[PDB]
Symmetry: C2
Subunit: 76 residues, 2 copies
């Protein structure tokens, strides 16, 4: 009975501020029953050493904005 | 306008060069008759992946799925 609010602006800004993230090329969100929100992102990263290190940070940022299921596609 | 042949899709993905493992192969039906897919993929190394990501995208396209997000494990 209670819609969940997604802060687009701070989500995208926090993602862009993750070390080694050069661009967010794609980001979609969609929502299911039980206010469960799913997201995809395509990101440009500096190099594959960054990405493996920083994927956890991205997942944490999503989680901090009430999105618990993500698929992150990097471009190097 | 194409069926998604599930068995061939999984089998083709698994046989893409440098793909070691395919997990979490999800197909989502969204509004406006949109189908997208997500997948977790274990690759040999990041040189393979950047080579293969086009191939995976095209395999998905071939099985009637036009938007994909592939999450690699190195």
């Amino acid at each position: 009975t209670v819609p969940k609010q997604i802060d687009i602006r701070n989500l995208i800004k926090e993602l862009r501020n993750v070390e080694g993230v050069e661009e967010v090329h794609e980001l979609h969100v969609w929502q299911l029953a039980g206010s469960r929100i799913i997201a995809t992102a395509h990101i440009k990263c500096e190099d594959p050493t960054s990405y493996m290190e920083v994927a956890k940070t991205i997942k944490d940022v999503f989680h901090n904005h009430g999105i618990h299921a993500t698929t992150i596609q990097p471009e190097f």
